[PDB]
């Protein structure tokens, strides 16, 4: 037979021009340049699910390093004594979420100099 | 297998073919295909030879198609051994589920289609059916052709298709002795 195929092309090009909903300028109407910024926006979104895994680390360290300067200790001096005396395996996240409560942090900070 | 027929050992036994049975059905569909489809070309298009390369090309909208189906015909054949070992097997499906119904002589007098509707009511057959009669009973063939479900078959002209579609088969006993002789 002969197959025209008109009902299969637009439903393959809506689903690209729906994922571009919100781009600047022409990049949410023209199919020819909305396909590039969908094939790139799935590529950054793989590359930047690895940086937010590793750039929340530089957040939690910088807050712990400031919360340790209340007691004279730097970050390297603190973590070194946090594994010796204390057997806790506390995350650098959960040893940072308690920064708000001075009392809490202080208690754990007293053990740092206990084995230092 | 022999009962009291109806008054209103090698053909249909066991060990169904399967693969071969399907093969026979695949070769019965191609033949029935008439195959008369033709399309133009780049050369048989009433077109120009000069440069406007050429005004009737494969990429041009005015020209024909590159490939395209041409006047052809597909007619293959099974062997003779695989052309008579399947008609028993589709018969053999019917001895299983009692889809064979055997009658004596197919009693008729005239061409009244009102009689056949009483006969289909009498044999309690509902959907499409078969009629096989060995002598081309003219009262049978002139009747029932208008009744939509059924069809009559002169007993030599049985084939592997109509046994599958019509799924039940009113047979005269006089035709049963003939069908072992050819196969």
């Amino acid at each position: 037979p002969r197959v025209k195929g008109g009902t299969v092309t637009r439903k393959r090009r809506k689903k690209v021009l729906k994922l571009a909903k919100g781009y600047f300028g022409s990049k949410h109407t023209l199919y020819k340049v909305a396909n590039q910024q969908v094939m790139k926006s799935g590529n950054y979104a793989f590359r930047d699910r690895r940086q937010k895994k590793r750039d929340f680390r530089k957040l939690w360290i910088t807050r712990i390093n400031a919360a340790a300067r209340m007691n004279g200790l730097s970050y390297s001096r603190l973590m070194h004594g946090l594994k010796l005396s204390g057997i806790e395996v506390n995350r650098k996240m959960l040893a940072d979420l308690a920064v708000n409560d001075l009392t809490a942090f202080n208690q754990l900070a007293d053990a740092a100099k206990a084995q230092l | 297998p022999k009962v009291a027929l109806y008054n209103q050992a090698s053909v249909f036994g066991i060990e169904p073919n399967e693969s071969v049975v399907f093969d026979a059905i695949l070769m019965q569909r191609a033949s029935l295909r008439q195959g008369t489809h033709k399309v133009k070309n780049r050369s048989e298009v009433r077109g120009g030879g000069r440069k406007p390369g050429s005004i009737r090309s494969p990429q041009w909208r005015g020209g024909g198609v590159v490939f395209g189906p041409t006047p052809r015909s597909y007619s293959y054949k099974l062997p003779k051994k695989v052309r008579r070992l399947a008609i028993k097997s589709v018969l053999s499906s019917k001895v299983i589920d009692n889809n064979i119904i055997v009658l004596e002589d197919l009693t008729l007098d005239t061409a009244k289609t009102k009689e056949m509707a009483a006969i289909l009511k009498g044999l309690s057959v509902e959907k499409k059916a078969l009629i096989v009669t060995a002598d081309a009973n003219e009262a049978v063939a002139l009747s029932a052709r208008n009744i939509p479900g059924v069809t009559v078959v002169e007993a030599n002209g049985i084939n592997v298709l109509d046994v599958v579609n019509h799924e039940k088969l009113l047979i005269t006993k006089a035709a049963v002795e003939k069908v072992e002789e050819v196969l």
Partner: protein, 97 residues
């Protein structure tokens, strides 16, 4: 006939070229970047073991397909013949039986 399922491993989808980038072979479609001489065929001696051993009835039994000139009897195997050409081995074998 409602569910005519074909035998497994009897059909295979035809390979296509240029109908997909991940399917394979789409960009370049996987194409890179004497005169007279009589012959009595071969009349095996073991073919007559199944059995008036004449060539007239030998061609009707299936022993002899084509009929060329005459018919020679070979004594390759081990088991009233009226033909023409007979191998030494066969002759002795026919007289030994």
């Amino acid at each position: 006939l409602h569910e005519l399922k074909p035998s497994e491993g009897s059909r295979k989808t035809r390979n296509r070229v240029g109908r997909g980038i991940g399917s394979g072979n789409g960009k370049t479609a996987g194409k890179g970047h004497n005169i007279n001489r009589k012959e009595y065929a071969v009349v095996n001696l073991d073919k007559l073991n199944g059995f008036e051993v004449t060539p007239e009835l030998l061609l009707e039994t299936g022993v002899i397909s084509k009929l060329n000139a005459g018919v020679k009897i070979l004594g390759n195997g081990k088991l009233t013949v009226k033909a023409n050409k007979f191998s030494a081995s066969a002759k002795e074998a026919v007289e030994a039986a």
